[PDB]
Amino acid sequence: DLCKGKNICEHGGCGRYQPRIRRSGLELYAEWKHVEKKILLSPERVHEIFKRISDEECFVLGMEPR
Amino acid sequence: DPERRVRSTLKKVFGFDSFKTPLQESATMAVVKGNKDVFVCMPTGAGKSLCITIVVSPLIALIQDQVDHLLTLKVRVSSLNSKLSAQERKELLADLEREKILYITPEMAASSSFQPTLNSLVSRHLLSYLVVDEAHCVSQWGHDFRPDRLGALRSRLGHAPCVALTATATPQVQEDVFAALHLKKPVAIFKTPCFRANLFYDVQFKELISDPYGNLKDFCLKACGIVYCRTREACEQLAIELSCRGVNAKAYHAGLKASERTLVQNDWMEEKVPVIVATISFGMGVDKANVRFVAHWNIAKSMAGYYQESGRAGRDGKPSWCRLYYSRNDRDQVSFLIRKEVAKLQEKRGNKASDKATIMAFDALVTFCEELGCRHAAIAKYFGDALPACAKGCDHCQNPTAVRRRLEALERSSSEAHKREWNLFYQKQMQLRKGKDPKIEEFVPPDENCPLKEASSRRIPRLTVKAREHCLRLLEEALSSNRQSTRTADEADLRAKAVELEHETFRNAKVANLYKASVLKKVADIHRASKDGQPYDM
Amino acid sequence: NAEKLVLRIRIMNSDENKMQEEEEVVDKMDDDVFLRCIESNMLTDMTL
DNA sequence: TGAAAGTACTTGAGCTTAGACA
Numbered sequence: 001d002l003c004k005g006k007n008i009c010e011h012g013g014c015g016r017y018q019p020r021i022r023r024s025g026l027e028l029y030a031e032w033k034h035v036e037k038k039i040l041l042s043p044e045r046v047h048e049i050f051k052r053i054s055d056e057e058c059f060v061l062g063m064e065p066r
Numbered sequence: 067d068p069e070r071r072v073r074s075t076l077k078k079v080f081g082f083d084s085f086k087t088p089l090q091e092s093a094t095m096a097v098v099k100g101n102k103d104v105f106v107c108m109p110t111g112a113g114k115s116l117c118i119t120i121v122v123s124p125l126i127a128l129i130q131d132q133v134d135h136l137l138t139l140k141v142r143v144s145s146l147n148s149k150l151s152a153q154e155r156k157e158l159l160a161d162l163e164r165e166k167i168l169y170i171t172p173e174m175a176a177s178s179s180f181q182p183t184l185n186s187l188v189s190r191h192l193l194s195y196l197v198v199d200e201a202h203c204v205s206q207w208g209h210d211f212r213p214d215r216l217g218a219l220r221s222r223l224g225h226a227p228c229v230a231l232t233a234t235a236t237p238q239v240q241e242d243v244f245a246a247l248h249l250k251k252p253v254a255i256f257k258t259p260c261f262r263a264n265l266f267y268d269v270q271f272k273e274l275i276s277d278p279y280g281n282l283k284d285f286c287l288k289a290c291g292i293v294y295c296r297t298r299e300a301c302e303q304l305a306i307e308l309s310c311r312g313v314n315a316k317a318y319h320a321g322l323k324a325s326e327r328t329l330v331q332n333d334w335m336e337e338k339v340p341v342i343v344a345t346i347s348f349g350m351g352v353d354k355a356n357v358r359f360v361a362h363w364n365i366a367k368s369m370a371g372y373y374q375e376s377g378r379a380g381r382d383g384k385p386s387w388c389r390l391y392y393s394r395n396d397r398d399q400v401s402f403l404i405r406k407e408v409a410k411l412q413e414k415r416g417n418k419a420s421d422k423a424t425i426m427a428f429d430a431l432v433t434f435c436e437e438l439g440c441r442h443a444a445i446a447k448y449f450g451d452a453l454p455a456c457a458k459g460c461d462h463c464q465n466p467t468a469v470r471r472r473l474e475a476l477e478r479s480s481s482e483a484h485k486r487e488w489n490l491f492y493q494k495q496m497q498l499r500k501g502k503d504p505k506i507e508e509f510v511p512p513d514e515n516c517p518l519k520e521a522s523s524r525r526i527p528r529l530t531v532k533a534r535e536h537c538l539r540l541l542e543e544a545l546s547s548n549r550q551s552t553r554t555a556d557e558a559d560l561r562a563k564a565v566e567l568e569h570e571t572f573r574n575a576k577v578a579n580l581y582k583a584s585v586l587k588k589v590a591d592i593h594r595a596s597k598d599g600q601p602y603d604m
Numbered sequence: 605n606a607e608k609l610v611l612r613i614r615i616m617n618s619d620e621n622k623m624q625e626e627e628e629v630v631d632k633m634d635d636d637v638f639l640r641c642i643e644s645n646m647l648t649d650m651t652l
Numbered sequence: 653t654g655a656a657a658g659t660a661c662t663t664g665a666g667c668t669t670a671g672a673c674a
């Protein structure tokens with residue numbers, strides 16, 4: 001609830017932006033607005049994204065890393 | 067001709083030769099005071115200083131910008147403001163009270179920090195010009211911390227000729243400028259035409275656009291630039307939106323901070339942030355030579371404000387488009403805003419039909435946005451100019467057909483939660499029914515001999531004294547009819563009886579129609595008692 | 605004290621005794637259908 | 653040929669401004 005309102009990533013680096021994730025059936029779409037537009041978010045990409053999450057950053061997310 | 071010194075100053079001290087426009091050259095030779103007051107309209111140029119002189123600039127940002135620019139131009143110019151250094155203020159007051167351009171803000175112009183200094187500079191006659199900077203309707207607008215001068219400065223400064231400088235000079239506006247400033251007739255009119263072919267004036271309707279955010283993002287992509295959102299943190303919202311869409315935009319809500327803006331502005335000056343969003347602010351910062359768009363997301367207040375904020379684009383002459391995003395909801399919201407503003411304004415001040423000048427100014431903006439034709443022609447008509455003969459560069463100039471279709475679609479686009487909905491609809495649809503000049507109070511006092519206790523009472527709105535007298539006479543006729551049915555004492559006590567009955571009804575009533583209804587209800591009771599043949603007791 | 609507890613209501617605004625009406629706004633909401641909305645609102649959400 | 657309801661999501665809206673002193 002707190003983080004769904006933060007559309008920008010700053011703290012830390014990576015001053016780039018955040019797309020909207022929309023679910024259509026079994027496919028996840030990284031709906032970039034204009035910053036192509038509806039790039040299909042392949043499960044390989046989301047696996048790579050999840051792989052780099054630190055243990056503290058997933059503990060605060062509520063999921064125990066071990 | 068001293069024109070020799072003018073040429074020398076332009077060549078070396080100024081860095082020009084005043085050749086941008088011969089009109090400003092003629093204005094400069096007019097300010098030599100061979101005429102009775104000169105009214106020059108600062109447009110794409112200036113020539114003051116030469117044409118100690120006090121500079122009445124309401125906002126200190128212009129004071130700074132100009133004094134530092136002149137100092138870099140090898141000119142000894144001083145400035146006076148409260149934010150200035152205390153030691154600098156003390157030494158400047160010391161060196162000006164005794165033995166060549168002064169920039170001041172009107173807050174201390176009528177205060178003890180400068181009024182004795184003003185008298186000293188007037189009695190010694192050390193002043194040669196009392197010029198008000200960017201004397202836009204700035205004079206006739208705002209907290210009005212300045213008469214305009216009337217005789218409190220135009221005359222208080224017998225010498226110092228006094229010269230005016232406004233961006234927009236419409237007939238009524240310029241004549242009110244002369245009336246308020248007491249500019250001695252015949253004021254020399256030096257007015258430049260407002261037509262500019264480098265601006266692609268057009269109006270887009272937010273309702274017709276499926277995604278106004280995307281359309282305005284595409285607009286700023288095909289182009290620095292200053293979009294203008296009205297207020298209500300919508301400036302910050304729009305800045306974030308554009309930043310989301312890929313337009314690095316910042317904000318300028320007055321509710322930020324000199325600090326916040328201090329950088330926020332300079333960042334923009336050096337293209338660090340290409341786009342900056344302001345609410346109604348940014349009266350300064352006008353030197354960019356790029357300003358590729360000043361498209362207004364929200365409607366302005368009048369042709370004065372709209373034209374002033376939109377002419378900032380295309381300083382070097384390159385095309386700069388500039389648009390206006392219009393919404394009917396925004397139109398009626400701002401109409402409510404000004405109507406309530408003037409309603410509270412009359413509660414604290416006099417009639418001041420300029421209050422209604424504002425409302426037909428806004429109506430002129432609305433009808434200009436909702437009209438069919440050249441936008442340049444409309445602004446020239448409002449400013450008193452002639453046909454611009456503008457080529458492509460308008461909504462109507464470039465494509466008359468598309469604008470007509472868009473307007474036709476907009477016409478057909480009209481058609482506990484409902485409580486606010488109905489309240490807004492009713493208030494907006496009957497507020498417009500009141501029309502212009504909504505003051506109309508003219509409370510008449512009791513003339514000479516009104517038999518009315520606490521007659522001068524404003525508790526019941528729109529209850530004229532004559533109406534209460536009419537009700538009193540009706541009660542008197544009812545009591546006389548009872549008199550010739552029951553044989554009471556006389557009429558002398560019946561007069562007081564009717565007065566007391568009217569006062570009781572007045573106290574028991576809260577609105578005019580209810581008061582009249584209660585008056586008529588008593589009259590029947592009486593007549594009924596007369597039919598009952600019994601005297602009308604209490 | 606009658607035979608029909610009749611009440612009459614009008615929508616008096618006029619223009620405060622000003623000059624006619626030139627270029628009236630598009631959403632004037634002609635008083636007949638404005639009275640339509642007024643009557644509907646009174647009949648539905650008056651909460652007497 | 654005729655559920656019914658509770659809960660987890662989105663999406664839109666959207667509201668004065670002005671500078672000095674403070």
Ligand SMILES: Nc1ncnc2c1ncn2[C@@H]1O[C@H](COP(=O)(O)OP(=O)(O)NP(=O)(O)O)[C@@H](O)[C@H]1O
Pocket residue numbers: 082083084085086087090107108109110111112233352353
């Ligand atoms: N005759 C001239 N020759 C050359 N440059 C000129 C001439 N007149 C004015 N300028 C320059 O044009 C600049 C713009 O003046 P001006 O348009 O008054 O300022 P602005 O703030 O850009 N617009 P405004 O709203 O009218 O005050 C001046 O500061 C001068 O540097």
